[PDB]
């Protein structure tokens, strides 16, 4: 057990402390996918974690690994987790802009105000998760085309989605509410309002909308599954499938604003027993 191999057990550790969904799916991958996988998923973990001047570090250790690859860093900010994805950039091309992409994003949502229109809400979307997404391509892809980082960024755009439609109580708490006011306009709905009184029909509807948003792009990823190296593909299809049944348990909960809900790993077993049939 190397120096290295420390670096990557932490950020697996990292991966399996906050993502439960991802990490059962990405933990399937070949050993060497697999590291790639955790170490950007650990920067990308940091970066969102940042909340100011860790971030600032962060971003300097990335620009740092970019410019010079194969030089030995004094990082500024989580060695284990830039030494792993030096590591990982020394053997695969990493997409660079797209996490500088994400810094930006995680920049402005100090200044929070909600999305006036579902465009600037699509928009976050990219910036959170479709940017993910581009970063992941080239490990999970024998072959990058444009094809390939469209739907990697749609995967990841949807898989946000999601997220929002699954935490939407929870996020009211912290004071933010990621519905547009355009679309909480038109639907007649008032989040504080549900939060303190219940579900009712102009809420189901309007989170409807988004959830067939979130189905469609899932099923368009689907189809397009080939882009990825034949090894992937059912794991990212289990990843996919795993989070989207997320949107049945919302329902099952009666769209609750008061509890995270989850897909418990008996589930995801039963979702990797279907994939795994059908290959
Ligand atoms: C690198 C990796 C797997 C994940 C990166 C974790 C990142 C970027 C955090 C900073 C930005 C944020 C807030 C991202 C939100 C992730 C929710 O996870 P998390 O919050 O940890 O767990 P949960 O909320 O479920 O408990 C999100 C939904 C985007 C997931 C998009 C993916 C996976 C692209 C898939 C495309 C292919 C597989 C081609
Ligand atoms: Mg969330
Ligand atoms: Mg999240």
Not at 63 to 90: C, G, N, T, W
Not at 156 to 184: A, C, H, P, T
Not at 193 to 214: C, F, M, P, S, T
Request: charged share 30%; aromatic share 14%; hydrophobic share 40%.
């Amino acid at each position: 057990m190397t120096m290295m191999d420390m670096n990557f057990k932490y950020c697996h550790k990292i991966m399996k402390k906050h993502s439960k969904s991802f990490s059962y799916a990405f933990d399937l991958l070949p050993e060497d996918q697999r590291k790639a996988v955790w170490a950007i998923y650990a920067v990308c973990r940091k970066i969102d974690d940042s909340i100011i001047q860790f971030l600032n570090q962060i971003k300097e250790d990335i620009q740092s690994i970019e410019k010079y690859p194969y030089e030995y860093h004094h990082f500024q900010s989580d060695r284990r987790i830039m030494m792993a994805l030096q590591h990982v950039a020394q053997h695969k091309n990493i997409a660079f802009q797209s996490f500088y992409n994400l810094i930006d994003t995680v920049y402005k949502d100090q200044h929070f105000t909600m999305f006036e229109t579902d465009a600037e809400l699509f928009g976050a979307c990219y910036g959170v998760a479709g940017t993910v997404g581009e970063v992941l391509t080239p490990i999970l892809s024998d072959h990058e085309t444009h094809q390939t980082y469209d739907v990697a960024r749609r995967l990841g755009e949807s898989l946000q989605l999601i997220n929002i439609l699954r935490d939407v109580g929870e996020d009211f708490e912290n004071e933010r509410i990621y519905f547009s006011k355009q679309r909480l306009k038109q639907y007649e709905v008032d989040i504080a309002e549900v939060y303190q009184n219940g579900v009712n029909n102009h809420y189901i509807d309007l989170w409807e909308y988004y959830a067939a948003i979130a189905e469609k792009d899932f099923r368009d990823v689907m189809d397009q599954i080939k882009v990825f190296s034949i090894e992937a593909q059912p794991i990212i299809e289990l990843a996919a499938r795993i989070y989207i049944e997320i949107l049945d348990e919302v329902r099952q909960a009666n769209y609750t604003l008061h509890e995270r809900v989850f897909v418990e790993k008996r589930k995801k077993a039963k979702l990797f027993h279907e994939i795994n049939s059908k290959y």
